[PDB]
């Protein structure tokens, strides 16, 4: 028989770069492990694959349906702080191994608010956490800019992200942000928010949120003739950003998981080869056939690392018993993942650290705007 896993994520809708990218990631992994026998001779199947569109209510309905199935031995959870936090108690109760690929809110994994101390026992995160992200972004802004304005989405991703970022700015001796506010995902009117910035004479605007929404922010900026550097979070720089913003992406900068920047580590380099072999120069690869785009780390290979690690836990436990698998994953030290080396412990359930992140900026060559290392 088989190893059955469940998965729900934003497969359709405004934020489907995450869910569908992660879906692709997991399928490829399954194939790879499957080509060589499965996990200790047991073929892996994604028995339940569900779409929540990044909606928290749908996530719950989807996780309810997955948990109900007794044959599922593990889960790749949804993209989004909303979906994740919404389902997190149901999952912690059930107690089967649960991979958080994307959601950056620290309490998702460490309810005790101490990163690397007292995690939810069955939750393993492949996110770039907000407090971790705040370090690089905090530093860059606190040295480059005088009055920063911050805008963020209303979910925990935006909420925590800002407290982590404002603080990281203070810590690097930068001045407290001259303007702040939240929007709710989907919000079309940010003129209100971009006007507060414009009137606050910001040096720059830092945004924590997602591509579709970031694009609106930037278009609102040009509409209000507020043209200053836009410093985005990793998740903001997705495909919808550039499609919505077009050539106005020039001058947007961001912190990003750097797995696909040159020079790549071997496993990032090898993954890229397998990905193109399977999917081609697709939406996630991007429009350079020679170079996979940077955003793949947060849209695809986190899903990849999550799958491979879950499978590795099973391989090492020699069972599908949750508590066992949980323990096994904790055995895994020095795992060379695509996005980072993984070294879990009974108390450390995340992997990515600042060395996996750099600051990039949209710059142009000829008539072509490219992300490049700061
Ligand atoms: Na493409």
Automatic annotation (TrEMBL):
3-hydroxybenzoate binds at residues 81, 104, 157. This is Leu/ile/val-binding protein. Pfam families: Peripla_BP_6. Residues 2-361 form the Leucine-binding protein domain. The keyword Signal applies. Coiled coil: none annotated. The keyword Signal applies. GO terms for biological process: amino acid transport. Belongs to the leucine-binding protein family. Keywords: Amino-acid transport, Signal, Transport.
